[PDB]
Known about the structure:
This is part of a larger assembly, with 2 copies of chain A, 1 copy of chain C and 1 copy of chain D. Chain C is mostly helical. Chain C has 16 helices and 10 strands. In chain C, a hairpin with a 5-residue loop joins strand 1 and strand 2 (about 45). By secondary structure, chain D is an alpha+beta fold. Chain D has helices at about 5-25, 50-60, 65-80, 85-105, 110-130, 135-155, 160-175, 250-270, 285-290, 300-310, 365-385, 395-410, 420-440, 445-455, 480-500; strands at about 1-5, 35-40, 45-50, 130, 185-190, 200, 205, 215-225, 275, 295, 330-340, 340-350, 355-360, 390, 460-465, 470, 480, 505. In chain D, the strands form 6 sheets. A 6-stranded mixed beta sheet of chain D has the order 7-12-11-8-9-10. Strand 1 of chain C pairs parallel with strand 18 (about 505) of chain D, so a sheet runs across the interface. Chain B: It is found in: Cytoplasm; Melanosome; Cytoplasm, Cytoskeleton, Microtubule organizing center, Centrosome; Cytoplasm, Cytoskeleton, Cilium basal body. Chain B: One of its GO terms (biological process) is chaperone-mediated protein folding. Chain B: Belongs to the TCP-1 chaperonin family.
Amino acid sequence: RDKPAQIRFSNISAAKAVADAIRTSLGPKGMDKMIQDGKGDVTITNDGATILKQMQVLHPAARMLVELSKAQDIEAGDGTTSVVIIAGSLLDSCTKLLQKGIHPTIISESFQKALEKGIEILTDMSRPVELSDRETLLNSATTSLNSKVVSQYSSLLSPMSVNAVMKVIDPATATSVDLRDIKIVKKLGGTIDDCELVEGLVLTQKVSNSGITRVEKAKIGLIQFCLSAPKTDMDNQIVVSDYAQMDRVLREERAYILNLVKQIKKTGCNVLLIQKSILRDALSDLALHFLNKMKIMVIKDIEREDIEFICKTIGTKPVAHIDQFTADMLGSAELAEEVNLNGSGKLLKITGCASPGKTVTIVVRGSNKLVIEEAERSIHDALCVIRCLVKKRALIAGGGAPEIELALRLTEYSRTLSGMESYCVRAFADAMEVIPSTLAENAGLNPISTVTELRNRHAQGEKTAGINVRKGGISNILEELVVQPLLVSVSALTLATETVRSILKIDDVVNTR
Amino acid sequence: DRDKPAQIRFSNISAAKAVADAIRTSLGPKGMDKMIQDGKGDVTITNDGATILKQMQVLHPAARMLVELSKAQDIEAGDGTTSVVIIAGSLLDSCTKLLQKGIHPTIISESFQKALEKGIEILTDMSRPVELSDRETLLNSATTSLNSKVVSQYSSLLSPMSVNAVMKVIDPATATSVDLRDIKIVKKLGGTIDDCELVEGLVLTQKVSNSGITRVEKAKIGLIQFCLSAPKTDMDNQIVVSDYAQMDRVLREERAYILNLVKQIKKTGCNVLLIQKSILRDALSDLALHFLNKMKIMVIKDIEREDIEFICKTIGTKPVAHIDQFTADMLGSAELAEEVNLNGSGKLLKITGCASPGKTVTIVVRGSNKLVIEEAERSIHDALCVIRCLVKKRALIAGGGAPEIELALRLTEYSRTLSGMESYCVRAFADAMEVIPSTLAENAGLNPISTVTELRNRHAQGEKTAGINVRKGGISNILEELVVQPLLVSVSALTLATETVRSILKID
Amino acid sequence: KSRLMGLEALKSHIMAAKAVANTMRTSLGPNGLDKMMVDKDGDVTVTNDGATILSMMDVDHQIAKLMVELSKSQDDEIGDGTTGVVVLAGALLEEAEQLLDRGIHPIRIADGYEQAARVAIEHLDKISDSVLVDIKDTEPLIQTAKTTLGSKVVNSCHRQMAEIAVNAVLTVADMERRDVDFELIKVEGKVGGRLEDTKLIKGVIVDKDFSHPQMPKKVEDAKIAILTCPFEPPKPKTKHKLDVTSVEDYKALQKYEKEKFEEMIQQIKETGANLAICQWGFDDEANHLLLQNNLPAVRWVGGPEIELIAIATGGRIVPRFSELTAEKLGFAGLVQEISFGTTKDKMLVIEQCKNSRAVTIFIRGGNKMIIEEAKRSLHDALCVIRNLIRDNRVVYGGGAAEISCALAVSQEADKCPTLEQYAMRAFADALEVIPMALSENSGMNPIQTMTEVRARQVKEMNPALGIDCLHKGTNDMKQQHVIETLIGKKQQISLATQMVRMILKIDDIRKPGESEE
Amino acid sequence: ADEERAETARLTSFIGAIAIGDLVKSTLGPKGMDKILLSSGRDASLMVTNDGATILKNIGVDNPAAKVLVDMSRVQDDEVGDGTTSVTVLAAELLREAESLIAKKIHPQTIIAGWREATKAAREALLSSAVDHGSDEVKFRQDLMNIAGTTLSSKLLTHHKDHFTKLAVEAVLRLKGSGNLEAIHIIKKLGGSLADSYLDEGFLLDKKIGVNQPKRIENAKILIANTGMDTDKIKIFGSRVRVDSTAKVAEIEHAEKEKMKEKVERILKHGINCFINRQLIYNYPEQLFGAAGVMAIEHADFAGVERLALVTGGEIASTFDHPELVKLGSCKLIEEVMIGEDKLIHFSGVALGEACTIVLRGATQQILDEAERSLHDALCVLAQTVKDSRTVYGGGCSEMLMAHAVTQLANRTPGKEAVAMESYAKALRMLPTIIADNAGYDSADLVAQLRAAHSEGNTTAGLDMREGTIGDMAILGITESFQVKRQVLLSAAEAAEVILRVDNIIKAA
Lengths: 513, 508, 517, 509
C-alpha cells in the first residue's frame, strides 16, 4: 500500500541523518556538545564510542545504531565507532536503488553477497601474524595504545597485555578467549606502574577493617546460608519491651556467633564469600566482625560477576549450615590476600585455584579515581587487540583504511559478477570511500573541495597503498604500524550487513497496542 | 457512468416541476391569474398555461420540452393547453420513486407508452356517439366547452357562427379532420358581432386600386409573384438618380419592360391579381400599376407571404412566379369579385364563390372597439377548436375531471393482475393522474385530497357519477349539469404528455 | 534581485534535462511508444524521432534549447539515433547530479567525460566489421530496413520502399567522390496512390499539365527543353481578360495563336527535345489546341520548380526564345510519362543518367497522416547508406555496442584512478541507460533484461548479442536484426559528451530575468 | 509548452476516452437511451438523437486521445455504414481494462503486443460464429432484412422503420451478383406521408418543370448533358464582355439570347425526345424545347444525372464536349404520375434493370433527414453482404464468443503476452453488459448465463434485449452481420493501441 513505501524512505532518512552528524570520527573534528536533556539535566560528552553505547533514542531505526556498537565490543573490542559509520554508508546505497526500481528484497540479498566477497579480499591483503607469538602481538598493542589517550603509560601496558591473554589462550584460529574469562577489576591505590597480572582468579569486593589474612593457605567459601542464634533463626523465649532486655538478647546472639566462626575456621577458611541475597539478613552484621577475628574475609551483598566466576573456574559449590557443619564441596585455594597499596584498597586474590585452563585477572590500579580510568580504557583496548588475533588472525590496514581500499578491488568483482546484485554492491564500493570525507565535512566551512580529494589520493595508490588515516600522506598502509586485526574489519562489515538489511525487510506500519 | 445522467436528470425534473406548479394554480375556469415579469420588466397577466412557459423559461433541458409540448397541443386539439403541462410534471414526481427502487429508465419509458395504449381503451368505453353531419349536436358540445374557456362574454353570438363555417367543410360522413388550413380567421375594422359572416370564397386583406374596376363578374384569378419592373439598382425600381443623364439611360430599359409585362397578363386573361409588397417583390412600378389597373383588371396590392401560401392550396390558384408559368391551369374560377365598404369601414376584397379543392371558409370577425375585435377572435378560435376535435373522433366524454380518476383506478387494478417488473410504473402513473382533478378542486374551493378520495369511491361503485362542478365547488354530479369535452381533447393531453416524459427519461 | 548562483543554477539544469530525456526514453527502439504533438490550433500529428519532436516543441528551458540543434546534426548524417543522443545527454547529467551530492565539482567530471568518450570510441572500433563493398553492404541495409519501417507507418518489412530508397543514393555517389549530401537527395511526396505505390526517379518529377482527359498524351526523345521563354505565347502568372474593342481583333487573335504553336514546336524540334518546360503559362483554350497539334506542353511551372530540374540536369535554362541551341538546354537520359496517383493524371518523369544532383524517390500516399509517417522512414534510410558510401563500416547497435563499451570504460576507472575516475564511472552507467530504457518502453523488465545481456558481455566480447528489438522471447541483435552504422553510433558518443562541454563554458548564470524568452 | 510524461498523459488520455464511452454506451442498440445534443459556442439549441456518430461531430472534444476516437468513428459511417456507435464503446472499454495493468508495474507495450495476437484469435472466432446464410433467393431476402432493421433503430428512426426495411432489401435483391449502390439512387424528398414510401423499378428524377412542358414520351431517347445557359459551358455562341459605350449593358443581354438558342439547335440535332441537363435552363431556351417536342429538366443532381447515364444506356456529354457525337440511352416509357402531392418523372424500361430508386417520404423534416442517413449506413452494410452472404449471431452472442475464444487462449499462455489476454477477453465481454442495461434487465444474471453457453459451445442462444431474457438466436430480427462486426472489432482495438502508444503527448496550447 502506501504504508510500505513511506516507512522505508523515512526510516532510512532518519538513521542516516543522525549517522551524518555522528560521522565526525577520528581525530579532532566537529564542535563539542553540552547537552540540555529532555529531563533537564546537564551532560557533557566526548569520544564517539562512549556516546554510541550511551545514546538514548526512541526511533526504531536509530536504536539499531546503539546496539551495533555493543556487539562489536564483545567480538572485537575494537572498531566500536567504526562499525556504525560504515553501516550509514550501506543506508546511502539503499535510497538510490529504490529510485532505480530495484526492489527491497533484492537489496537485502546483495548485502550477503557484498559480505562474502569482501571479507575474502580482506583476508587476501592481510599479512598473517601468529597469534601465539609475542613480538608481533607487542607491535600491534602499541598501535591501539598510541591511538588512544596514553602515549607514556603505553610502555607499561603493551607487555602486560601479551602475558594476560597468554594465560587464557587456546592454540587454534577458532573462536576462543573472551572477557567472560578476562576479568577486569578496578582498585583505588597503586599506580599504572604497579598494575598486576595474577594468572588465577582475583575478585573485586570490599573487606571490613585492615588487619586480616595476607598469607598462604585458604579454603574458598561459596555459602548460601544464614546463622542460627537467638533472635536470628534459633528459638529464644526472651521477649523485649525494654532497652535493657534488648541488650540481653543481642549479647547472647553475638556470643554464640563467636563460637560459630571457629567451626568456619576449622574447615580451613581464610576466605568466605557470602551470597548476594539474604534468607533473612544472611550471616548477620554481627557475624562479619567476628569472622574478621578468625582471619576470614567478608562481602555481603556480593556483585553478580563474582558468583559467575567462582563457580565456573574453581568448581565451587554451595555448603550446608555451620551447626550442621559445612559439606566440603568447596574448591581448592592457597591465597587469601587483602591487597592494600599506598594506604587504600581492599581486595581478594585466590592463587592455587583450579582452572579449566582459562581465566586470567588483571588488576587495574591508579592513585586517584580519574587515574584508574586512564589505565582502564587503554588496557581494555590493548587486551582486546591481541584477543582478536586468537579468534581470527592476521593484520590488515587500520583506522578503517582497508574499507576504502576494499572499494577498488570490490567494484571489479561486482562487474564480472554480472547479477541483479552487482549494481547494489558497486554503489556500496563508492559509499565506503566517503568515510574520511564525511568525517571532516561537518566541522567547518567550504566542504566540497577537500571531500573529492581524499578519495583520489587513496585510490591512486592502488591495491597495496593509499592515504593513511593516522598520519596522512600516501604511503604503504598494510604494515607501517597503521594496522588493526583481520577480525575488527570483517566483524564490522558482518554486523552492519545484518542490522541494515532488517530496515529493508519490513512492510506496512507496525506498532504493538 | 450513468450516474452522471442520473444526477443531471433529477436536476432537470425539479426545474420542470417548479415551472409546472404555477400552472396547477391557473387550471380551469377557477384558475389563478399569474403576474409574470419578463426580462423586459413588464407585468403580464395571463391565465392561459401555454404563454407563461413561452415568455420566459429557465435554461434547463426539461423546461424546454414543456414549451414544445404545449405548442404541439395547440396544433393537435387547440385545447387542453393548460391541462397537458399538469399531467407532465405530475408523472415526473412518480418517476423519482421508480428510479430509487431500481427500475431502469428504459423500463419506465416503454411502460409509459404501454399505459397510454392501455388508458385509451378505458376512456372510449365511457364515450358516447353524436352526429357529425348534424349542426345542433356539434353546437351543444362546443357551447359547453366555451363556458370552461377564459373568453365567454361574446362567445354566445360567435358559437352558431363557428359551427356554420365547419359544416360547410364537412362533406362526407367521416367528417374529415377539419384543420385551420381550410378555416381562415380574418378581421375587419368597424362593425358588430351580428355583422360577422361566412364568405363562401376567401376575404383578402387590404385593397389597393382606385383607377381599377370596382365590381367585375365572372373573374379569373390570377396570381403575381413575378416583378412588374426591371430589377433593383438601389431602389425597388430600376430607376435611381445621380445625374440628369443617368436617369435617362435607365428609363430606356424600364419603359420597354413595363409595357411588355402589363400586356402579357392581360393576354392570358385575368380579372383578379394578387400582388405582394414592395419589400417582398424586388421591383414593382407605379407606372406599370397605373396601366395595369386601367386595363380594367381588379387588383389588390400589398399582401403577406403567409397569405400567398394560404391561397395557393385553398382556392387552387397555384404559383405563377415567372412569365412562363401564366398558363390557364394556374388560374382559378371566381364567380364574383366585389368591393364591400359596408359592415365595418375600410375596403376589403370578397371573392364570393370560388372553384376550390377541399372547401375553404373564411369568417370575417368584427367588432366596435379594438378590444371587441380581439375578444371575438379568441372566441371563434376556442369555439372552432373543439368542433374539429369531435369530427375527428365521433364519441363524446365528460369534462369536470371525472374521467381522469376513472382511468386511474382501472389502471391500478389491471396492473396488479398483469403483474411484472413494469407493474410499479403503471400503478404510479395512474396515481400521477390523481393530482389534476385534486388541483382543480382546490381552485374550486373545497379541501382537495378529500374531494378526490370521495370521487374515487363514487366511480368504483357507480362509475359514471360525480365530477367537479362549478356551482357547488365540489362534489355534485356532472350528469345533471353537462360538462362535456371532445374525446380527442383528452386523448391529446395524455399521449403528448407521455412522449415528453419519455424523451426526458431517455435523455442523458 | 533573483539569482540562481553556482550550485543552484546547476540543479535547475538537471531538472530540465531528465524531463526531456524521459520522453525520449519511452520512444527508444522499434519497441518505442509513439509521439503525439498537439499544436496551438489543436491539430493533431503522430511523429517519431528526437529531432522533429523538439523542433515543434516550444522550448521551456536552456538545456532544451541546446538539444534541438544537436539533434538536427544527428538527423542530417545519421538519420536515426536522434532520440538516443538526447537520452544519453540528459542521463549522463542525471548521474552528474549524484556525483555532485557526494562532493565532486561538475568541473572535474566534465573534463573526464571527454576522456571517457575517447575510450568508448576506441572500444567501439573493435566491435564488428569496418570493411564492406557496395554490393555487400546490402544485407545490413536489409536489417536496417526491417526496424526502420516497422515502428513508423507499418509494423512490418516492406521490401519495395526499402530497395527504391537505397538505389537513389547510389546514383548520386558515383557522380562525385563517393559522397552524398542531404540536399542531393529528397523524398518528395504527393498524394494519390497507396504507400506501396512508389517509383525510383533518377532525376525529378513535375506535374504534367493537361487541359482535358480527351487531349492526346505522348512523350518522345530522352532530353528536356528547359525554357523560361515561350513554347506557346505567355500569360505570365497574373490575371488577364480580353481587351479587344472590335469583333475584328478577336478573330485576328486566334490565327496568330495557331502560327505560334507551330513555330515553337519546330524550333525546339530542330535543336533536339520536343517536351517543353516553360515557367509561364497560357489560358485553357490555347493549351487545348497545342495538345491537339501534338508534342505535349508543360505549362504553369513554379519559379522554384524550374530551378529544381536545372540543378539535377546540370545544364542551363535559356532567358530567351532567340537563343536556343542544344547546349543551352539541360541533359536527360530519359523522359517517360508515368501514371501519377492511381485514378489521377499522368506526370512527367525526367530521369537522368547524364548528371545527378537531385534524385527524388517518388512516394504516393492516401492521407496526410500516412504519407508523413512513410516519408519519415525514407529520410532515415537515405541517411544510414550515406555513412556507408563514404567509409563502409556497421556496428551491432540497439544495446550490443553500448554495454560492451560501458563495461570497458568502467574497468579503466579502477585502472587509472585520479581525476577521471568519477567521470568514467558515470560515463559507463550512461551508456547502459540506452539498452535499459529500451526495455522500459518494451514489454519486459529493464533491470532483468540488462542483467541478461551483461552476463554474455563477460562470457563473450564484440557481441551480436544485445537486447530484443522485435519484442521477442529470445534476445540477440542478429535475430532482432538491428544494425547501425559504426560511424552512426560513434557520432552519438561525440554528441552526448558535447552537450556537457557547451553547458560548462562561461560562468554567466546572471540573468535579468531574460534567459529563455 | 507542456510536456506530458507517460503516466500523466495516460490519465488525461483515459479520462478523454471514457467521457466519450458513456455517451455512446447509452445510445447503443434498439432500446438504447438517448443523448441530448447541445450546440456549443454558438447559441444553445437542442436536438435529441440516439446516434453515436452525431454526438461527436455536433459536440466536439479538446482531449487529444478523444480526437482519435472521433477519427475512427468517421471510418465506420461510410465504408461499413453501421457500427459507428458500436465501435466507439468497445474502444473505451479496452482502455478501461488497460488502467489496472499500467498501474501494477506493467508497461504499455506489453498490453499492446498481446492484444494484437488476441485480435487474430478473435477474428478466427468471428468466422466460426459466422454461418453462411442467403445463398438462395428465399434465404437471401431473410438475410438482408435482419441487418437493415438493426441499423435504423441504433441511429434513430424506429416508428416507420419496418416500411423502409422492405424497400431497402428488395433494392439490393434486384442487383444480383454484384454489390452495387451505383444504380440504387437514394432520394429524400418533401411530400408524401411518413407511412407511405415508394420504390420505382427504374430511375426516378424528383425534379419537375410543371405541366407547362412535355412529359409524355413513348420510346424515349436520352441525352445526358452538362449544358450552361448562364454558367456558359464551352461551345460559346455569344460574346466576350467589353465596355466601349454607355448603352453597352443592352448589348450584353441580347448576346446571351443568341447563345441560349444556338445551343438548343445543337441539342436538337441529336434526334431525341428527352433532354436532361445538370445546369440551369433559362426562361428563353425552356420555351424553345417545349415547342420542339423535347422534355426539359433543369437542376439535376451531380450524383443522379451521372448515375442515370449508366442505367439507361446513354453516356454523358462532360461539360458539353459532345454536341451531337454522344451515344443515346433508351427507355420504353416516360410517364409523369403523382406519388404523394408531388410530380415526379418516372423512367421505366431502364436498360440495366438492376437500377431502382428508393424514395423517402417525410412529413416531419427532422425525421426525413435522420432517416436518409441511417438508411444509407444500412445500404453500405447490404452491399458488403452481397460479396460475402453470411451473418453472425448478433445480440451479444458473438461478443461473448470472441471473449471466450480469447479466455481459452489466455489460460494456455504464462508469458508477457498472456497478461493482456485476460484484459482483452474482459473487454469484449463488457459490451453485452452495456446491452443488458439498455434492455433494462440486470446485467449480472444474463451475461453470466450467456457465458456459460459459449463455453460448452453454443451460438443458438444469445441475449434478447427485446424480451429481457436469455433467448434463442436462429437468424432472428436481432442478429448482426459478419460484415459490420469484423470491421468494428478491428477498429476498436486499433484505435485503443494507438491511444496506449501515445503517451508523449506534447500539448502546446
